[PDB]
Write a protein that binds this ligand. Structure first.
Ligand SMILES: CSc1ccc(/C=C2/C(C)=C(CC(=O)O)c3cc(F)ccc32)cc1
Ligand SMILES: CSc1ccc(/C=C2\C(C)=C(CC(=O)O)c3cc(F)ccc32)cc1
Length: 264
């Protein structure tokens, strides 16, 4: 059966590479100093942010904190698209009842977004604009309340998560585990979801033993990270509700509204 779990690890890694254009491997090459990739422009104060608008080519007049809020929406919407495409490659996912597919995505996308965003972070800041830019943790922390408090729990989680030193092939199986959670609210057929996740769990466990043979209990350490993930979602939802009440000239992207509607 080991050969089957290895073929599943290989399948998920291959689909991960095809679904996510900016991998952890490329993110680390950018952050460290490697010559396979090029150096980002660093935004650290109000001054350099304006220089960065003219220096960084962005994919997508208001206040600075508002402009960053809107920027993260566009990337997050893109992330949902990438995650959805990846979910369809997880064997058995598309054969599930359609309402459960929707439900698994609705509750899984943000847990995956924060997981993969850790690949883009270090203790000092986060890559932006497919890695062309780098915004510092202290600069985001200084933005006017309550916008300045949006990213800090993500950084704190990323520092703990990155200490596990997972690579993309590990992360491919782990985010599949996250998607296939039989405990999501409103699921209709829990059993076929759990059966798929049990297989994904055995594949993840084997991958972690083979890939990190001197990292004891990495499987257990990784699984316990779900506590931090859900706390982030919880806090993030709370801050979004403050923004909704204080900025009535803004709305979340419709795709994100649907994800957050009746969540928990
Ligand atoms: C002023 S510093 C800041 C403040 C607010 C935001 C707002 C954010 C918004 C709307 C989203 C969209 C979603 O929740 O899906 C998001 C996703 C993330 F990973 C991280 C941050 C944010 C981003 C940065
Ligand atoms: C041209 S005025 C501007 C406005 C906002 C930004 C800031 C951000 C943008 C575009 C993004 C999207 C991405 O990463 O591609 C982002 C993601 C994050 F976690 C944190 C901050 C930012 C840069 C420039």
């Amino acid at each position: 059966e080991s050969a089957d779990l290895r073929a599943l690890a290989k399948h998920l890694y291959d689909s991960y590479i095809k679904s996510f254009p900016l991998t952890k491997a490329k993110a680390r090459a950018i952050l460290t100093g490697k010559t396979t990739d090029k150096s980002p422009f660093v935004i650290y104060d109000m001054n350099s942010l304006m220089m960065g608008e003219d220096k960084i080519k962005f994919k997508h007049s208001k206040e600075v904190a508002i402009r960053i809020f809107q920027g993260c929406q566009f990337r997050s919407v893109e992330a949902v698209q990438e995650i959805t495409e990846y979910a369809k490659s997880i064997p058995g996912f598309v054969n599930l009842d359609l309402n459960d597919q929707v439900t698994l995505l609705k509750y899984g996308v943000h847990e995956i977004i924060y997981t993969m965003l850790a690949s883009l972070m270090n203790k000092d800041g986060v890559l932006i604009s497919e890695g062309q830019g780098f915004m510092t943790r202290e600069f985001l922390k200084s933005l006017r309340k309550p916008f300045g408090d949006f990213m800090e729990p993500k950084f704190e989680f990323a520092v703990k998560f990155n200490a596990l030193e997972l690579d993309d092939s590990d992360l491919a199986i782990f985010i599949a585990v996250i998607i296939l959670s039989g405990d999501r609210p409103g699921l209709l057929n829990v059993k076929p979801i759990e059966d798929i996740q049990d297989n994904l769990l055995q594949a993840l466990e084997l991958q972690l033993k083979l890939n990190h043979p001197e990292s004891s209990q990495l499987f257990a350490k990784l699984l316990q990270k779900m506590t931090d993930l859900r706390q982030i979602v919880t806090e993030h939802v709370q801050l979004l509700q403050v923004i909704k009440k204080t900025e009535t000239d803004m709305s979340l992207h419709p795709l994100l509204q649907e994800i957050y509607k009746d969540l928990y």
